[PDB]
Amino acid sequence: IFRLLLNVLMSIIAIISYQWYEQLGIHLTVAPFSLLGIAIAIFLGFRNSASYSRFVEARNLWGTVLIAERTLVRQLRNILPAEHDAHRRIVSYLVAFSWSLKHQLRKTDPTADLRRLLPEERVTEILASSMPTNRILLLAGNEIGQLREAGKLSDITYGLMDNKLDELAHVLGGCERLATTPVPFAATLILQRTVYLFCTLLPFALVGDLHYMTPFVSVFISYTFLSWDSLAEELEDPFGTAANDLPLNAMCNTIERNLLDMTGQ
Amino acid sequence: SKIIFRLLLNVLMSIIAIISYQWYEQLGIHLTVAPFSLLGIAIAIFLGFRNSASYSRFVEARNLWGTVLIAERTLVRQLRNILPAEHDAHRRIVSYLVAFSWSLKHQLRKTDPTADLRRLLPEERVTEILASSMPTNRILLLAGNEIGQLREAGKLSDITYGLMDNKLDELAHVLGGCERLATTPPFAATLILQRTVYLFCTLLPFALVGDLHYMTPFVSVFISYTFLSWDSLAEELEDPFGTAANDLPLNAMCNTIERNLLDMTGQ
Amino acid sequence: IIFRLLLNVLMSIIAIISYQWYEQLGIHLTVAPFSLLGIAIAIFLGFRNSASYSRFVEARNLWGTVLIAERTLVRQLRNILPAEHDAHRRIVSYLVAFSWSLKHQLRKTDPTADLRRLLPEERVTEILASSMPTNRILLLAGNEIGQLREAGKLSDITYGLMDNKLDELAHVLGGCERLATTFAATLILQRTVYLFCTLLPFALVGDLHYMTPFVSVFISYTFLSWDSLAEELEDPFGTAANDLPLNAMCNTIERNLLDMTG
Amino acid sequence: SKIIFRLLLNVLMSIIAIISYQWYEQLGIHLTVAPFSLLGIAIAIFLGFRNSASYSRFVEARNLWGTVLIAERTLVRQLRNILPAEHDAHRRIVSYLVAFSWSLKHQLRKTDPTADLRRLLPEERVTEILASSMPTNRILLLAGNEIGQLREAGKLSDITYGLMDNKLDELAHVLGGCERLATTPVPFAATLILQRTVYLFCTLLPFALVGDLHYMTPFVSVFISYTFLSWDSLAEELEDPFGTAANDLPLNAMCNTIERNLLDMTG
Amino acid sequence: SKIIFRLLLNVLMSIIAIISYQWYEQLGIHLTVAPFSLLGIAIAIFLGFRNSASYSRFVEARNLWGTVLIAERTLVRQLRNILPAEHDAHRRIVSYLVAFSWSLKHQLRKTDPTADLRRLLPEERVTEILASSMPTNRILLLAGNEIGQLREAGKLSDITYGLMDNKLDELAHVLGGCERLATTPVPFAATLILQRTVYLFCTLLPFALVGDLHYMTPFVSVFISYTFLSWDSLAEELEDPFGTAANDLPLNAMCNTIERNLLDMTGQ
Ligand SMILES: [Zn+2]
Ligand SMILES: [Zn+2]
Ligand SMILES: [Zn+2]
Ligand SMILES: [Zn+2]
Ligand SMILES: [Zn+2]
Ligand SMILES: [Zn+2]
Ligand SMILES: [Zn+2]
Ligand SMILES: [Zn+2]
Ligand SMILES: [Zn+2]
Ligand SMILES: [Zn+2]
Ligand SMILES: [Zn+2]
Ligand SMILES: [Zn+2]
Questions:
Q1: In total, how many domains does chain A have?
Q2: What residues contact residue C192 under an 8 Å CB cut-off, 6+ apart?
Q3: Alpha carbon of residue E74 to chain centroid
């Protein structure tokens, strides 16, 4: 990539610069730039650790959707094995919540998936709100509440599936917070500029003791910094459509297929 | 910030170090780079662990504000799933939940909550809330009376009361976590680490000038920037409930919460 | 592995040889630049290994929860329905089937024999037909206590106490499927650590001469031993040395539940 | 903060090293700085990790005291929300909950809790609590009896009794967790060898620097020693979180805050 | 202290090193500090991460045993508060709860729980516990039957049965956790690598140091090696938390504390 190509030529410039720039006293020893490189590597490791934690919290939150939606459908079959109208409808809302969450995080438009799973009557209320995924939850709770006032659910077994709508609410909230949070941007931008300036200004610090071999031993260590710095660029925002990013769309079909299998479809 | 000035000190110090260089060899004073390499590496390790503790303190603060929104969403949702017809209780409870959020904001920011309280609640409750050592505690007490009176009237069983009571429990744990991060910021985690990061940076050009005849200023400023950049980020993370640009945007988060709760109750 | 150590011992020897021309060709491969590169690689190896250990530790805990949850579900059936041993043995068979199925699911092998050894062939087909057979097994564990509730021998309360244990086992199922399915981070380190070990003696040749190959191999031992432990801790459901003994764990589970039903 | 002592000893070792350096090489005794940077960086790594473990102990202690306030605040809230008219019982339980906080504090500080018990509770139960060898735990059971008597009198249902029983379980986890944190010198050697090891490195450091610095040895040596000593000292401070240092837990503040909260919270 | 073998051996290596370095100049062998610093710094980072794992695992073991004391305290509290008249049931459930602690100590120490079981329970129930291949787990089942018998006799409702049942769940995560920790060491590879790499590094160190320290090599090579060995040893003093060594957990003392707590709450 560009960065190391720039470094190899910049390394080339440093060799020519050293010889033809001898008159000015540009003595640049290796010891100071070693203290600097060790320092910013300590910071990159700590930063990349913080980014990686953010990525697996995202991955955990989505793991909880599949768990929570499997157990509420199983509770539904176990507690009310006859009410397939309630099961068809509730599975619709559970599946739509997943796709709505996915389109929300991807800042893309959920209408194709929501008509596919819901009557456009309801699909009109959901998109009329600024919080469409939250209202899908509130509607799924309404189906469960209906069963309670009909005397089909007691308060006890109502509460046990109420607790699964709680697990899903914490997913909704946490995902929004992860999307919304901008704390990583300040640290990383200072590190990114610092990492870059350090690599390009580095052959001028090696050329005194390395001569021609400067390009080789400079393009190498530039690779190991840019690569490890770029790694945090991938985990900082994990809801991206990138192959590196969570396969959010594979995960929603798994959700839909599984909730379809459990409902005798 | 204070980082631009401390950068300018370092430059001046490099110039002082070059002139100090002529007197340095006869003076019998030699400052090699190797002892400062060791000191600089140890300082970087300590700042690494420190920033990590500051970032976690910051992450938890926004996590705690994350579940105000979550707990209040589901409490409003339970109210409508269990008592779909009690819109009076829906509205009073929502006004308490909205008041809890704004008063929590005022509590962490050490500012006056009466205006926000007077917009959302009747005046006799505002006096009740402000007489309390913990006004946001008193608000959870009042919301609890709403669900508690619905229970007395027989419109809530003990089961469905407990379900909503749990959400007021979650709000209390949010309340105590925020109070805890405010009253528990360690001193030497910034006493040492800014005095020594400061003193290390001003002393560095002197240790560097023997090896770099005129480049002492440039490389010394690069090193000082990265130590001061990394060090000050931890104090931009040290007051997550503060009011700087990198602190939590708690006003916007209170508007988000209230707009969320109003949207759920048809307003 | 050992091939790589032997190659470093050679590659040191090529540096041994190629040193005769360092002066005439103009080479100054000095040590301090490689001393900085190795220290940074160690920092990233330490962090990557620590993240690899966490996935392994979390995988270990998920499987611990299977044994804990299935134990106390069986405790509850005995404490609450002590004379219902037709139901005890049916539910226990699904629980044992659950843990073997998850082993096969994470290992990508055939559960049919295990399912047949433990369940009637009628339900072995229902399980072998679902998208997630482990998921179906829990569904069928839930109809057993579900029916006891409409048999009226479980109240909604005591039903829910055992329902909670099935929620616990679903969290394990999702936890494992998330770790089994969840490149650069390694790919960066996998490529970089190797190239540093082959180039190091050429920069070491300069002061170690003949004792170049053994410090070069000593250093490379420390680095490669650490990097490969991360790759096997990364795949905790694999078959490597320090991978989870899943077969032993399912047997422990089985002879635990076959100890609590009479 | 006896850092000043081994700072002033460090200056001494520096001047012996200076005057005795010339004498010192009488047969080939030589101390370079490179072995002392390998050793010093290693010691720095182990200090960061140790300090990170000590900080975690501090954060857990604060979290445990946090939920004392949270659990006690919601327990008395549930009492007023569920039984608004039974204030004879609110006063009895509030004083047990307040006595639990103070009794917990005296137990961790190894101080006499009699004055705070005789001020909150009737003397017949004060002697029952002092007779027991686990007094804080006996306060919990006593608070539990109050809830239990309200349940045998039909004023509480099993469900509503259950919601409050939960909060007593929260306090039971606090007590045990606090007791485990107090009794954990465990491997005190981990900081005990490190305290000495850091001490020997800082005494020997000027002898390893005089060849490079000469007269500037005591300045660079005290700076390196200060950095290492203070970070070590912060750790020995953090890992005794119930101690009496300033960086420790304001236990007094929290006990008074919850008493005021509970009092202001009922009249 | 397998440490003085490696520490004292370091002194012998240092003397062999001085004579050896003048010969090394003649031979073609030559050792510098800087390569070993790269080694030593790499080892210390790895030593630091391993020891953090070893420490976390020791902390989890101490946590789990603390839960035994917490959960049995509240189980006893609930019983008195909910069934204050039921002293016979109080005493029976307390003995199982005490028996579980001791039986968990014995099993983690692979020692014989028979004498303790017979001091606390009727022999007819000691036989049942010892017949099982998982005795401590069976102690939980018997305690659950005491609670369950109270539920069927109508003295406990399903609600208050469940409040107590949740506490036996707490004890079941302790038992699982301890069994897991008792069988899952911090990887053999981790400690093996670090055992041999610190060893080899400690013996070959005085060689690389001899050119810089002349006659001072042993007084510094033993100081450096001592740091790396004491820090690798601490991971081997946190590996065996259920053993009987001084820095292991005082499980016997922790078990006595639990017993006298529960007798304190039941008058006995
Ligand atoms: Zn769940
Ligand atoms: Zn159906
Ligand atoms: Zn919640
Ligand atoms: Zn309404
Ligand atoms: Zn010059
Ligand atoms: Zn459990
Ligand atoms: Zn049976
Ligand atoms: Zn000498
Ligand atoms: Zn709580
Ligand atoms: Zn009152
Ligand atoms: Zn508990
Ligand atoms: Zn009794």
A1: 1
A2: A223, A224, A227, C41
A3: 25
Residue of C92, C14, C46, C43 lying closest to C261 (CA atoms): C92
Candidate from B28, B35, B165 with C-beta closest to D163 = B165
Identify the bridge partners of residue B29 per DSSP, sorted by sequence position. Answer: D214
How far apart CA B252 and CA B246 sit, in angstroms, is 14
Tell me whether residue E86 is exposed, middle or buried, using C-beta atoms within 10 angstroms of its C-beta: 0 to 12, 13 to 18, 19 or more.
middle
CB D96 within 8 A of CB D139: yes
Q: Which of D1, D18, D77, D151 to mutate to test the interface with B (most CBs of B within 10 A)?
A: D77
- B70/A172 Cβ within 8 A: yes
- With a CB cutoff of 8 Å and minimum separation 6, the contacts of E215 are D27, D28, D29, E18
**Nearest residue, CB atoms, D158 vs list E66, E73, E160:** E160
To test the contact with chain C by mutation, choose from A1, A78, A98, A251 the residue with the greatest count of C C-beta atoms within 10 A, namely A78
Q: How far apart are CA C98 and CA C114, in angstroms?
A: 10
DSSP helix/strand/coil, B148: helix
As a whole number of angstroms, the longest Cα–Cα distance in chain C is: 95
Distance E160 CA to ligand 12 centre (A): 17
Contact between chains at C72 and E169 (C-beta distance less than 8 A): yes
* SS3 labels along chain C: CHHHHHHHHHHHHHHHHHHHHHHHHCCCCCHHHHHHHHHHHHHHHHHHHHHHHHHHHHHHHHHHHHHHHHHHHHHHHHHHCCCCHHHHHHHHHHHHHHHHHHHHHHHCCCCHHHHHHHCCHHHHHHHHCCCCHHHHHHHHHHHHHHHHHHCCCCCHHHHHHHHHHHHHHHHHHHHHHHHHHCCHHHHHHHHHHHHHHHHHHHHHHHHHECCHHHHHHHHHHHHHHHHHHHHHHHCCCCCCCCCCCHHHHHHHHHHHHHHHCC
Domain residue limits at E34: 1-268
Q: Which residues contact D53 (CB under 8 A, 6 or more apart)?
A: D239, E52, E55
Q: How many CB atoms lie within 10 A of CB B54?
A: 20
List the single best residue of E7, E50, E81, E83 to mutate versus D (max D Cβ within 10 A): E81
Q: Do E27 and C82 touch (CB under 8 A)?
A: no
Minimal C-alpha gap between A138 and chain B (Å) = 6
Determination approach: X-ray
Chain C residue numbers with beta carbons less than 8 Å from the beta carbon of E133 are 255, 259
Cβ–Cβ below 8 Å for A60 and C178: yes
Q: How far is A252 from chain B (nearest CA, A)?
A: 22
